Design a binder for these strands. Structure first.
Ligand SMILES: [Mg+2]
Ligand SMILES: [Mg+2]
Ligand SMILES: [Mg+2]
Ligand SMILES: [Mg+2]
Ligand SMILES: [Mg+2]
Ligand SMILES: [Mg+2]
Ligand SMILES: [Mg+2]
Ligand SMILES: [Mg+2]
Ligand SMILES: [Mg+2]
Ligand SMILES: [Mg+2]
Ligand SMILES: [Mg+2]
Lengths: 205, 108, 134, 58, 113
RNA sequence: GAUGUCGGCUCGUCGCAUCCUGGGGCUGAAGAAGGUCCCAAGGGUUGGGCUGUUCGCCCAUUAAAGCGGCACGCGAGCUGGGUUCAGAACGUCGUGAGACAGUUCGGUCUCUAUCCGCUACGGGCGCAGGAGAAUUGAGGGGAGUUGCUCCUAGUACGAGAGGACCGGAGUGAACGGACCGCUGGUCUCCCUGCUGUCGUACCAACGGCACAUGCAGGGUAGCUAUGUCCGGAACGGAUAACCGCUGAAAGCAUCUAAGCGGGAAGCCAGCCCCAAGAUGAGUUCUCCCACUGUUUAUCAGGUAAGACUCCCGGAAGACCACCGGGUUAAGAGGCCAGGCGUGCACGCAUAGCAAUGUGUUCAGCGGACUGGUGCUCAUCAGUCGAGGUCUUGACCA
RNA sequence: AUUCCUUGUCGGGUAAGUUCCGACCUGCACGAAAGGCGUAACGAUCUGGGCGCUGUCUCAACGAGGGACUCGGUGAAAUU
RNA sequence: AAGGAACUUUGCAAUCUCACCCCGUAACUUCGGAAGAAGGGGUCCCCACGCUUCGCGUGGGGCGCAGUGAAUAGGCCCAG
């Protein structure tokens, strides 16, 4: 349901009481609302929020049209949120609250093409008792004349990372509104400067 | 990705000065970190780790120093976060004259 | 960390000078006696973990002898342990304290400092004979 | 031996389904503002040596 | 990944002897044409060098002399060129790219003071 | 005119005649612990010593350390210990050459994948205008493990000894996902120290070579685990074994033939991820608009909206792709300030016979980090890109 | 290195040893110049054990260089 | 990092060792040898002093993490 948009910023040490706790400072800048999809307009409920600002000289005509339909001010990023609402815009103020468990979802860093050891763990082989299949290189891929082929999915080398990931249940250590800053314990996905989306715990204990 | 203009640098300071503590100078040479051991039952103890300083890694919240000490016949090293709540105060015992910000060599 | 083949020092007068880690228990001290393993895997023993160990050299004259298969509870790892304030301790040598099925030392005394982690692990008697609890 | 090796000659056809991707992209020539000969955007006009003034020797 | 920040295509000393070799030619001849990329390598390096020269103290000379082994060229950068760039916020060296080449299809370019 | 053979290693996947977790009937089931049969394969099923072993024996643990199938799975994947080459030896047989249920030491396992299959990534066309962006989810994938302690409760039970179900708490393991703040690793020239040699005339100061860093000490960003954080769920629906309510045919009895309810780690939904080439190609919001061409060049040609090309870069990347900037500019470099690394620079002065020490000096130097600034280069310019088929129906004055 | 039954039996070392060392003897099919038993020293010999060290391994990571990828030049092969 | 043969048919491979002084060196032995056994120490720079000189010894001093300071450069042992 509820949720906001933001830029990851870095992690750092912070003591809450006498326990040093690592956190990820996320800037959940205010988020405008640029379109309310209704189960009677677009067939399903949801809100269109926006994020970084974009210079107007860079805005497509078609987009202006959109953004103007709600006198907003071109953002550069728009995203939806099912079953969400209110009036005006969306800022963490009153949205999230210190202590709330949340789910941060960003785009994982990108590892490019990675072998099986690093993409699936595997194990490759030896390093001395004979070879050319030193450490990496997968083993065998199938079996034989039966299923005389390979399974759809057999883990293999392939572009690793650069995916959508969602780390669940994160305590919100501290919220400094009026800076739209927010500290979540643990570690959120992707690179600093990267987009991140925080929300109510999709399904927490 | 989100391309907002922003000094991610300071944003961090602002969220880090609140947990930053200065301490006497020192660089090596001995110290005596008289720290609290609130960790016993309720009973809030009080140990004093003192001995050569061999490393100052970090800055801001993360800043810290590493002291090496031999207690009861066995070498021991501790890592303290300048601003670690368990650290009450630190005092120099004697400035040392060495030649490199490390001393690991001193582990023999 | 500690693992099978890993020789630890003995920090008690049990009579055994050095022991070789035969296995890593999942340190069950609790309730009535020592509890039984929390899983059959677990590969590393940390200060506070109990392990099963063989004896490689014991002193001449002492309850424990060369070859005895015993139970010790790891008190000093050359590994860093990270206390919650965010500090880190690490001793120059791994060393353990031989014990019995109640978690009490076989020795009348412990030598050298002992990881303060044994206190949370509830090994009070061990902490009891400790010269220091760093 | 020469271990992997092909099972059959490939169609003149197949062999062409392949190459359906080797067609050069002609340069996108621009016309130099001075001597008006065609040039390569962002480079110097090989015919006059200009790039606003005359950089390369005649 | 590989999110580093620099270039090679040679070992560790070659890549240093080149950047020094081009650094010197660039300063000894105000301009040189070179592979497009190589000039790209050269540019920052050289600018740094002009800025070290831009001090006049023996120290700043002695430092430059670490990456300009030709006494005559050091004097030039030291006394003729560094002083001249006095008033510009270290920002002069520009690269012009020319045509592609024949022997290997490689697009050459100009890096000039 | 060749279907490579034992074992291992790597990679898996499937059956169930289930090893462990889950649910049940009976027990000779007091409770605790078991036995046994029924249902049930979701997930899980440790590390060592001996042997080529497969097996099995043993150590130490575990909820458990299941049994089989896939050419006794897997050598165009590796090994090569075992055994069905050539050497040699012992025992044994043969008069011999030789031989063997045998035993033993030695003994070349072939870079480049065409087609299918598989993991990744583009290009084309399609989806009845030409575009920018936001999405529904048809379908599909991943995940699905378990202990221990405490509470209830020293309760129910039991002569006692011992000692629960049910439900409610915590804390580990292993596995995975993301991450780099921490603790560490690395960091191929970021800083310093050191040797021999050659060179920059010499002194001082530096450079090269001694790996493809000469050696050593340290080390930012990055990348990374043995480091962090989070997760396997809840509820729900329909069920298996099994238990039941109302109830005849057999005026009684009956979980049943009408009907109805409860009920598993399993099935479906749920969680995370992909997803309209879901050619049945969906939805929504916005933008451009109706041009030109004489039955001689029948259609393409100017163009809009928009985008590509090209340049400069990137936490994106094999290439393409993807994100950012392109002077109405802070995109990258330089430059400045700062951070952080190294650890006190060259020169001079002083102390000393000198080697050196000290002062000037928290000096000097400087990869990738945070900002600022138009000093540099992103100049100029080109290319591509709509005018919307028909039928029926409904609404408009 | 000559034993089949066999990982014979006891002892040794090991937490645990089908191997190894020492005994015993029931030597399937030891044995005295097809030499018997022993023997300092020698061995790129074969076997078992130990100390030290280690990426052999728990688990792998980071870095370097040379390919692999991309563009320009030249341009094969087995197979079919 | 921590561990240290847990790898595995086998420590295969790759480390450790690694030069020259001094001290020290077992069983067993055909008394030659086993031995470089094993183990330990030193090793740079300045100065004075003396030495057979290049060189070296003695004493004092100095610098680094480290002085065959970089290249060449034995891993050792028990038993069969
Ligand atoms: Mg490996
Ligand atoms: Mg560090
Ligand atoms: Mg049961
Ligand atoms: Mg095959
Ligand atoms: Mg180094
Ligand atoms: Mg139900
Ligand atoms: Mg590129
Ligand atoms: Mg652009
Ligand atoms: Mg910058
Ligand atoms: Mg080519
Ligand atoms: Mg013998």
């Amino acid at each position: 349901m509820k949720g906001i948009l933001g830029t990851k910023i870095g992690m750092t040490q912070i003591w809450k009481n006498d326990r040093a706790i690592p956190v990820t400072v996320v800037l959940a800048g205010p988020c405008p609302i640029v379109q309310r999809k209704t189960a009677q307009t677009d067939g399903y409920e949801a809100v269109q929020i926006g994020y970084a600002p974009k210079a107007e000289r860079k805005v497509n005509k078609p987009m202006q049209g959109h953004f103007a339909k709600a006198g907003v001010a071109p953002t550069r990023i728009l995203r939806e949120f099912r079953g969400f609402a209110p009036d005006g815009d969306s800022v963490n103020v009153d949205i999230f609250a210190e202590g709330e468990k949340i789910d941060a979802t960003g785009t994982s860093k990108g590892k490019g093409t990675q072998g099986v050891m690093k993409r699936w763990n595997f194990a490759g082989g030896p390093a001395s008792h004979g070879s050319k299949k030193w450490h990496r290189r997968p083993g065998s891929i199938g079996q034989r004349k039966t299923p005389g082929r390979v399974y759809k999915g057999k883990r293999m080398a392939g572009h690793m990372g650069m995916e959508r990931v969602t780390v669940q249940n994160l305590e919100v250590v501290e919220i400094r509104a009026g800076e739209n800053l927010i500290l979540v314990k643990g570690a959120i996905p992707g690179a600093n400067g990267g987009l991140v989306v925080l929300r109510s715990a999709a399904k927490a204990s | 990705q989100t391309h907002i203009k922003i000094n991610r640098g300071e944003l961090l300071r602002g969220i880090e000065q609140d947990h930053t503590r200065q301490l006497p100078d020192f660089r090596p040479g001995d110290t005596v970190r008289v720290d609290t051991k609130v960790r016993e039952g309720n009973r809030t103890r009080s140990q004093a780790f003192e001995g050569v300083v061999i490393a100052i890694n970090g800055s801001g919240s993360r800043k810290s120093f590493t002291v090496r000490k031999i207690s009861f016949g066995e070498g021991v090293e501790r890592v303290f976060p300048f601003a670690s709540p368990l650290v009450n105060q630190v005092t120099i015992v004697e400035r040392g004259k060495v030649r490199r910000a490390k001393l690991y060599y001193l582990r023999e | 960390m500690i693992m099978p083949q890993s020789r630890l020092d003995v920090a008690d007068n049990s009579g055994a000078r050095e022991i070789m880690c035969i296995r890593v228990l999942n340190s069950g001290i609790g309730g009535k006696g020592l509890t039984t393993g929390g899983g059959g895997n677990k590969r590393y023993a940390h200060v506070g973990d109990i392990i099963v160990a063989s004896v490689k050299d014991a002193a001449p004259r002492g309850a424990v002898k060369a070859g005895d298969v015993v139970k010790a509870v790891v008190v000093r790892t050359s590994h860093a342990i990270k206390r919650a304030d965010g500090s880190t301790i690490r001793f120059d040598r791994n060393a353990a304290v031989i014990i019995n099925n109640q978690g009490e030392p076989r020795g009348t005394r412990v030598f050298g400092p002992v990881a303060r982690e044994l206190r949370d692990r509830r090994f009070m008697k061990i902490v009891s004979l400790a010269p220091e609890v760093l | 031996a020469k271990h992997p090796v092909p099972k059959k000659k490939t169609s003149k056809s197949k062999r062409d389904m392949r190459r359906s991707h080797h067609a050069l992209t002609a340069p996108n020539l621009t016309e130099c503002p001075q001597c008006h000969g065609k040039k390569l955007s962002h480079h110097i006009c090989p015919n006059c040596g200009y790039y606003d003034g005359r950089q390369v020797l005649a | 990944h590989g999110k580093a920040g620099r270039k090679l295509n040679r070992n560790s000393s070659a890549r240093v002897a080149l950047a020094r070799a081009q650094a010197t030619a660039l300063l000894r001849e105000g301009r040189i044409q070179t592979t497009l990329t190589k000039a790209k390598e050269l540019r920052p390096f050289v600018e740094q060098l002009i800025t070290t020269a831009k001090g006049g103290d023996l120290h700043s000379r002695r430092l430059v002399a670490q990456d300009i082994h030709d006494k005559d060229v050091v004097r030039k950068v030291m006394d003729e060129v560094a002083p001249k760039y006095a008033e510009r916020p270290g920002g002069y060296t520009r690269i012009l790219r020319v045509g592609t080449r024949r022997g290997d299809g490689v697009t050459m370019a100009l890096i000039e003071l």
